[PDB]
Design a protein around this ligand. Structure first.
Ligand SMILES: CCCCCCCCCCCCCCCCCC(=O)OC[C@H](COP(=O)([O-])OCC[N+](C)(C)C)OC(=O)CCCCCCCCCCCCCCCCC
Ligand SMILES: CCCCCCCCCCCCCCCCCC(=O)OC[C@H](COP(=O)([O-])OCC[N+](C)(C)C)OC(=O)CCCCCCCCCCCCCCCCC
Ligand SMILES: CCCCCCCCCCCCCCCCCC(=O)OC[C@H](COP(=O)(O)OCCN)OC(=O)CCCCCCCCCCCCCCCCC
Ligand SMILES: NC(=O)C1=CN([C@@H]2O[C@H](COP(=O)(O)OP(=O)(O)OC[C@H]3O[C@@H](n4cnc5c(N)ncnc54)[C@H](OP(=O)(O)O)[C@@H]3O)[C@@H](O)[C@H]2O)C=CC1
Ligand code: SF4
Ligand code: SF4
Ligand code: SF4
Ligand SMILES: [Zn+2]
Lengths: 114, 207, 94, 144, 178, 342, 156
């Protein structure tokens, strides 16, 4: 209620930047699969991009979306350059972590947690 | 004469209170709550719209040549809605005195950057962002410094756990250094130590 | 007090010996568990009882600043004997 | 002259370990021929020589045993074999050896020191010194 | 006060003598033969090295290394499970769990020190009001495994039963300073 | 059920599972992945080793404190095996060789050693025993290894029933001897193949799949008298498979036929070696017999693993063999192999 | 005389070589690296024992993890350990690297270098005295002295 903006009048002007960011990531992924010798396909990389976008698709405050664009631009800086490594890039895929069950009964069989 | 306790001055207290009146009456649009501690230290508190004018003033005025930035910090206080109490520690080198400038922030109420005033503040602002999440306008780089590259979180907030949310170890299956969820062989034994007896009645928060 | 159990392991002054079904005996294979032979119960019981003259006395460990904090023991009873808390030295009066 | 005196000192160093057998036994085993005053021997066989004209890192030294507790330490020499009676003197914590200033004897102090054990058996395996905290219900051996 | 390090007073004095001197500083490497002679001087000095396992560096009674739990001359266990050594241990290396000994005495059923968390600071030995745990002299207990450096009550009591002849003497030296 | 083998934790490192396991071929190629998948969820892994301690270092990690216990042993000497299985719930036999030695033959690797281990397991009183035979293991086969492995698969049942016998296909992995073995045929300027690779079918499987399968079978209440066929998907014809190997490893491809007798003699004189041989007669024989259609048996998906295609994990193995000018090449530039069903 | 005896003696010889010429790596992260320097200093000269630093890992036979190992520096440590050519050894120095040390419960610290690289010997301290690290090095020498590699080759 009558708060200040950051880089955004409201949500459409921010979704503009969001789509620009998706654009940069989609153009950047094949270069990172090549530079650092990743052992994946360009398809699943872009799928991970769209997934990590959809993880924040439930939000409406423009300031949150702007800060998320900022964080994504930082990650894109680190990934365009090779400051980070195959380790940090493959850290998104969760290639070792066993899948956390989403069923009641398996949780009941292992653990007291919901 | 009391050897165990610290000796107190008068002239420094009077000097810094007078200079607080000076800054207050000369920069009223931005100033709040000027104060001088028991130990001789001045402390000015500022509306975030006043960061650049106040810092440029204290850097470039003749009676206030605060042209060396010592620190730029932040203090997470979840009680107050504007959590982060951002601080600037400055010295003069012409009058041999220090001053403190303070302003507030939130996760979604950033502050103007200061590199146009002190170039020292580049990495300090990057650190405040890395640690607390306070975005800074018109900053050149503004990326992390201290944390890992693929790091999710702002550690020095009070709402972040000390042991973190992820943990590392090398797996032979993938031949990498994978990040795994935190799982300790020994839980950190938190201790409750605050005695239930008022030691300092001067700071007695009344009801 | 270094009696063994039917499994064959040594037992500590804290009765601790792993059960026959406990898998945590593997760590003592081609190896050994460190267990101390000099027990404190037996060695403080292998001490005399210090007759004294007064009814209240004072026990430091014996070295002053090297013992324990100076406490005082009452010796009015005759059903039993006084006993220090830090050390286990016993006392009596006649 | 001076050269002659230092060569005489060298000859004294060469001919002060028994014979060639002992000279080599010391030289190939410590890489030093330096002679000192025998301060005192150990119950295992260490020697603990001394020579105060040297500077303050070589005026005390050990010549270790060839067998401590069945290990054949002719070559596998290590610093843990110095018992605490001589640790204090060798590391220059005192100017008082245990020949003149021996330590207080106690019924619980180890009589036979042990070298460092980290790879062999006789080493330290950790474990919980506590006991079963929660006790499980032992059901009956009968039906109904 | 202050003073300059690389400030000449001023210039404008030159003669053929000074020019020849500077030109023989140049063209002969004069200021380099000085360093050469320095290193040569060091060649003919007694070196400061020591045959380590035989001759060893000097230490003090205050030196703090391995840990050990002590006893009284009666052989009685000296710790009393007061649990402030773990309260202050700034690395949370010490876990303690206690019970009555069945003699009715306050003693520990547990005393562990993860020696890969201990910063070897001595707060525990200067806080123990009975001088039960100390930080002994030893610094030669490197191991081939992590598990060996996770101590318990038995290893600490063995370190005490081992190094008491040295611990007691170093304490004998070092009290009256604490 | 002892109170210490009760599982606790969120299923990871620094937790407990109750899967105290003796893994006998732990110093190999499948055993390292098995030990990793065990330590990854929290479980004590007794690891008997005969090698030098240099070659147990990579296993020294992959487990929290005290959960990895190594003890030395010898197949000739009993009481070095009872000592290992004395406190265990599970035992996992991965012992095996691709060549005989003066001291140990194939019988004394696949038959007599599992019999001894399973005798010790039954006498100690453990609950399970996971034996690892081969998919082609048959008493009427061509190779000494495969016949010996079928004989061991039978004798293990005869001694220790209530057992689990896993029968994988030829496994591929980072340090295998299947894809690396076919890729090292570049040092010779042409690759020989019996009948040019046709009339031969291969259904390889990945190490992670077999490892997860074993690690679930040691917890599945099923699989007590069940054999398994750890095959993997996408049955392949040998010529096309080697073509895919030599495309992903972008070197070249010069195939040509060769009979089995001269290639057997080649394998023999290559196996004349005191060191680890490059090729052997039994290896050629095992390479040039097809993999059985495994659909008479459960497999992985009856155990809780979705098998991984070769095309997704082969580059991790084969980029080692590439040169510059091709090392920075992706998976999607090799026109994948042609699958068959037959 | 006998093949096994000849093999034992050849093992002794190669172990002596790898034991007497070990070339650690200039890898010092924190305070413990200063005691590593002091072990390179004249009092406890490493070069006396045939122990000289090579800044490259490929010219290095051992690494000394002297300092705190962060989540940000662990990939580099592992890349360097891989780049070292076998036979290769690791020596964890100080409570920060053996375990977590004074930072075990923090968010950017791996709670032991043994989570990332295998460790032959652990040197405890904060910091360890240079005599202590020298004890660790000579313990690594004692360890190499009993490899029996060619013996197991003969007995396979
Ligand atoms: C190849 C030709 C031989 C090259 C010379 C090799 C000399 C090896 C040698 O001198 O052994 C020294 C060593 C001398 O003992 P050491 O050096 O190992 O004992 C350690 C000595 N201190 C305590 C000083 C560190 O001999 C051996 O210990 C056995 C190993 C050599 C075996 C050679 C058998 C042939
Ligand atoms: C004079 C100075 C100049 C010196 C230069 C010349 C060097 C002279 C050295 C002579 C001794 C040669 C021994 C080299 C052994 C090195 C390889 C090794 O030890 O690995 C064990 C190797 C391998 O044994 P393995 O078969 O048990 O390997 C095990 C394999 N893994 C690791 C997978 C479990 O054994 C040998 O091959 C030794 C015989 C080599 C003889 C070659 C002639
Ligand atoms: C009869 C009439 C006719 C007679 C004709 C003959 C006339 C006299 C001729 C004299 C000429 C002598 C030649 C000297 C060459 C050196 C020239 C020189 O000026 O030095 C070069 C260099 C200068 O350094 P810089 O401080 O920057 O000064 C330059 C200012 N623009 O300074 C340096 O060189 C420093 C770099 C080199 C350092 C290397 C370390 C060497 C250490 C000394 C080794 C000595 C042992 C030599 C043994 C050799 C025997 C075979
Ligand atoms: N391509 C494959 O790998 C396939 C393998 N299999 C089966 O998988 C199992 C393991 O395969 P893999 O892991 O490749 O085998 P490896 O050769 O990779 O390692 C096997 C283990 O067996 C041990 N070993 C071998 N011979 C002896 C012996 N005589 N005495 C004691 N220990 C011995 C070795 O110990 P050390 O190395 O220390 O001697 C090694 O750790 C085998 O049973 C094999 O039949 C089946 C199909 C495919
Ligand atoms: S010396 Fe310091 S860090 Fe070590 S156990 Fe004692 S109090 Fe803890
Ligand atoms: S060691 Fe000392 S400080 Fe620690 S619990 Fe025992 S008596 Fe208390
Ligand atoms: S263990 Fe101590 S001395 Fe060594 S790096 Fe850590 S804090 Fe520094
Ligand atoms: Zn008392």
């Amino acid at each position: 209620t009558s708060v200040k903006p950051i880089f955004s009048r409201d949500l459409n002007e921010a979704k503009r930047r969001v789509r620009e960011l998706y654009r940069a990531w989609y153009r950047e992924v094949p270069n990172t699969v090549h530079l650092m010798q990743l052992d994946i396909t360009v398809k699943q990389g872009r799928d991970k991009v769209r997934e990590m976008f959809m993880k924040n698709a439930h939000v409406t405050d423009p300031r949150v979306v702007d800060l998320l664009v900022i964080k994504g631009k930082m990650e894109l800086q680190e990934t365009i350059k090779v400051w980070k490594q195959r380790t940090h890039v493959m850290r998104f895929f969760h290639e070792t972590e066993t899948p956390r069950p989403k069923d009641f009964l398996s949780k009941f069989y292992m653990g007291h947690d919901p | 004469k009391r050897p165990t306790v610290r000796p107190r001055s008068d002239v420094t207290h009077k000097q810094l209170s007078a200079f607080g009146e000076y800054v207050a009456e000369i920069l009223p649009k931005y100033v709040q709550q000027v104060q001088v501690s028991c130990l001789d230290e001045l402390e000015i508190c500022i509306h975030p719209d006043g960061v650049i004018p106040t810092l440029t003033f204290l850097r470039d005025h003749t009676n206030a040549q605060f042209k060396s930035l010592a620190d730029l910090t932040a203090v997470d206080v979840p009680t107050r809605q504007n959590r982060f109490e951002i601080v600037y520690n400055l010295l003069s080198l012409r009058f041999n005195s220090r001053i403190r400038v303070k302003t507030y922030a939130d996760e979604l109420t950033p502050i103007d950057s200061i590199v146009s005033v002190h170039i020292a503040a580049n990495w300090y602002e990057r650190e405040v962002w890395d640690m607390f999440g306070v975005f800074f306008f018109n900053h050149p780089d503004l990326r992390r410094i201290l944390t890992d590259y693929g790091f999710e979180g702002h550690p020095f907030r009070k709402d972040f756990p000390l042991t973190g949310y992820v943990e590392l170890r090398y797996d032979d299956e993938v031949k990498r250094v994978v990040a795994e969820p935190v799982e300790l062989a020994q839980e950190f034994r938190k201790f409750d130590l605050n005695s239930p007896w008022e030691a300092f009645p001067a700071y007695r928060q009344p009801p | 007090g270094v009696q063994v159990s039917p499994s064959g392991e040594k037992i500590t002054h804290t009765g601790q010996v792993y059960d026959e079904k406990d898998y945590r005996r593997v760590r003592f294979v081609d190896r050994q568990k460190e267990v101390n032979e000099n027990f404190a119960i037996d060695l403080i019981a292998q001490q005399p009882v210090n007759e004294v003259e007064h009814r209240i006395i004072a026990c430091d460990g014996g070295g002053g600043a090297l013992g324990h904090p100076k406490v005082y023991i009452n010796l009015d009873k005759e059903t039993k004997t006084g006993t220090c808390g830090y050390c286990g030295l016993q006392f009596k009066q006649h | 002259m001076e050269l002659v005196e230092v060569l005489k000192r060298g000859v004294q160093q060469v001919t002060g370990h028994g014979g060639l057998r002992g000279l080599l036994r010391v030289f190939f085993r410590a890489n030093d021929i330096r002679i000192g005053t025998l301060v005192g021997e150990d119950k295992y066989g260490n020697k603990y020589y001394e020579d105060n004209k040297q500077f303050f890192g070589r005026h005390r030294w050990v010549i270790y045993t060839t067998e401590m507790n069945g290990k054949n330490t002719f070559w596998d020499v290590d610093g843990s074999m110095v018992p605490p009676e001589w640790h204090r003197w060798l590391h220059c914590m005192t100017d008082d050896p245990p020949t003149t200033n021996p330590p207080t004897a106690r019924k619980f102090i180890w009589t036979n020191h042990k070298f460092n054990v980290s790879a062999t058996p006789e080493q330290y395996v950790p474990y919980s010194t506590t006991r079963k905290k929660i006790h499980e219900w032992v059901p009956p051996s009968t039906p109904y | 006060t202050y003073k300059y390090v690389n400030k000449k007073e001023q210039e404008s004095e030159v003669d053929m003598k000074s020019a020849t001197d500077n030109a023989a500083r140049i063209l002969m490497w004069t200021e380099l033969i000085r360093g050469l002679g320095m290193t040569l001087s060091y060649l003919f000095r007694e070196p400061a090295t020591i045959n380590y396992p035989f001759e060893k560096g000097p230490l003090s009674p205050r030196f703090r290394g391995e840990h050990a739990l002590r006893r009284y001359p009666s052989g009685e266990e000296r710790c009393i499970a007061c649990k402030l050594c773990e309260a202050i241990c700034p690395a949370q290396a010490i876990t303690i769990e206690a019970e009555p000994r069945a003699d009715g005495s306050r003693r520990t059923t547990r005393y562990d020190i993860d020696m890969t968390k201990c910063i070897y600071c001595g707060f525990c030995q200067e806080a123990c009001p009975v001088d039960a745990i100390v930080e002994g002299p030893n610094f030669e207990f490197s191991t081939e495994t992590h598990e060996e450096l996770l101590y318990n009550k038995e290893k600490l009591l063995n370190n005490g039963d081992k190094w008491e002849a040295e611990i007691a003497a170093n304490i004998q030296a070092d009290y009256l300073y604490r | 059920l002892h109170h210490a083998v009760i599982p606790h934790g969120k299923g990871g490192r620094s937790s407990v599972s109750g899967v105290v396991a003796t893994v006998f071929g732990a110093t190999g190629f499948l055993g390292r992945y098995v030990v990793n998948h065990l330590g990854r969820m929290g479980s004590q892994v007794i690891i008997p080793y005969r090698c030098d301690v240099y070659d147990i270092m990579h296993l020294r990690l992959m487990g929290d404190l005290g959960q990895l216990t190594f003890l030395e042993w010898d197949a000739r000497d009993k009481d070095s095996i009872r000592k290992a299985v004395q406190h265990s719930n599970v035992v996992i036999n991965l012992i095996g060789r691709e060549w005989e030695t003066r001291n140990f033959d194939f019988e004394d690797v696949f038959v007599n050693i599992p019999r001894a281990i399973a005798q010790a397991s039954k006498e100690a009183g453990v609950e399970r025993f996971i034996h690892v035979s081969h998919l082609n293991a048959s008493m009427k086969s061509s190779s000494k290894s495969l016949r010996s492995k079928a004989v061991g698969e039978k004798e293990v049942r005869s001694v220790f029933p209530e057992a689990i016998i896993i029968r994988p296909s030829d496994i591929f992995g980072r340090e295998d001897r299947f894809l690396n073995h076919f890729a090292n045929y570049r040092w010779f300027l042409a690759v020989p193949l019996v009948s040019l690779g046709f009339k031969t079918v291969k259904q390889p499987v990945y190490v992670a799949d077999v490892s997860k399968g074993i690690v679930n079978a040691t917890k599945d209440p099923d699989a007590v008298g069940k054999t398994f066929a750890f095959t993997g998907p996408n049955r392949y014809l040998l010529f096309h498979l080697v073509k895919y190997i030599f495309g992903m490893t972008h070197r070249t491809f010069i195939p040509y036929p060769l009979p089995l007798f001269v290639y057997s003699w080649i394998g023999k004189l290559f196996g004349l070696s005191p060191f680890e041989p490059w090729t052997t007669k039994d290896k050629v024989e095992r390479i040039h017999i097809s993999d059985v259609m495994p659909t008479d048996l459960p497999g992985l998906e009856d155990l809780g693993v979705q098998p991984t295609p070769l095309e997704l994990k082969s580059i991790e193995v084969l980029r080692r063999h590439r040169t510059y000018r091709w090392l920075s090449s992706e998976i999607e530039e090799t026109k994948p192999a042609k699958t068959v069903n037959y | 005389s006998r093949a096994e005896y000849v093999v034992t003696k050849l093992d002794d010889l190669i172990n002596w070589a790898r034991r007497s010429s070990l070339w650690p790596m200039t890898f010092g992260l924190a305070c413990c690296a200063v005691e590593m320097m002091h072990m390179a200093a004249p009092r406890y000269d490493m070069d006396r024992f045939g122990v000289v630093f090579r800044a490259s890992p490929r010219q290095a036979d051992v690494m000394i993890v002297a300092g705190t190992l962060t989540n940000k520096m662990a990939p580099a440590l592992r890349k360097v350990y891989d780049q070292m050519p076998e036979p290769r050894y690791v020596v964890s120095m100080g409570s920060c690297a053996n375990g977590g040390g004074y930072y075990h419960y923090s968010y950017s610290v791996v709670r032991g270098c043994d989570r990332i690289v295998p460790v032959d010997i652990y040197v405890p301290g904060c910091p360890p005295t240079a005599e202590a690290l020298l004890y660790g090095i000579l313990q690594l020498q004692r360890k190499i002295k009993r490899e029996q590699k060619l013996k197991i080759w003969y007995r396979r």
